[PDB]
């Protein structure tokens, strides 16, 4: 197994997937490493097992059917792992923890959003429907890029979405479009 966090990139006390080479600290994982269970398989490859018992799956899919499934188990699971590969990305950070507005010539979004408060709400089933994660997910660099405004601080939303819109992209095998 790998000796980094496959999410953070640092070492620490990590727990190995039984099924391939990636390594978690307990509460990078999404959801976090569980108790007991041997073997254990990371998030990673119960994905790819959702792939390779129904290769239909990956077939385009209009955004707009996918945003109406309702969260049973192997929705939640995708949502999950699309919350967990934005953690990957180390600009993350900005938006992990819940954010306060004072700017001068800005006022605050009237309705803040934050990945941990997102990573809450996956973990109390809060969530019906695909369209209620994808929502708030969209949410976070909206009310980013509305704040700052002119300033090039506004750049780490955009980073950050398209981050969140290629891996929503490929997990949910939306139909490639030009
Ligand atoms: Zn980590
Ligand atoms: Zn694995
Ligand atoms: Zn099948």
Request: charged share 25%; with cysteine.
């Given at each position: ?86 953690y990957?990305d180390s600009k993350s950070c900005f938006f992990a923890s ?17 990945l ?63």
């Amino acid at each position: 197994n790998s000796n980094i966090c496959e999410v953070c990139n640092k070492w620490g006390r990590l727990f190995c997937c039984d099924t391939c080479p990636r390594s978690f600290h307990e509460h990078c994982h999404i959801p976090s490493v569980e108790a007991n269970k041997n073997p254990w398989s990371c998030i990673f490859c119960r994905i790819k097992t959702i792939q390779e018992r129904c290769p239909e799956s990956q077939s385009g899919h209009q955004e707009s059917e996918v945003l109406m499934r309702q969260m049973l188990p192997e929705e939640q699971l995708k949502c999950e792992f699309l919350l967990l590969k934005v953690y990957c990305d180390s600009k993350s950070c900005f938006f992990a923890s819940e954010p306060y507005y004072n700017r001068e010539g800005s006022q605050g979004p009237q309705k803040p959003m934050w990945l941990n408060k997102v990573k809450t709400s996956l973990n109390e089933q809060m969530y019906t429907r695909v369209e209620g994660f994808v929502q708030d997910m969209r949410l976070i660099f909206h009310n980013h890029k509305e704040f700052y405004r002119e300033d090039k601080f506004t750049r780490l939303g955009i980073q950050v979405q398209d981050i969140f819109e290629k891996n929503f992209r490929n997990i949910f095998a939306i139909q490639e479009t030009s």
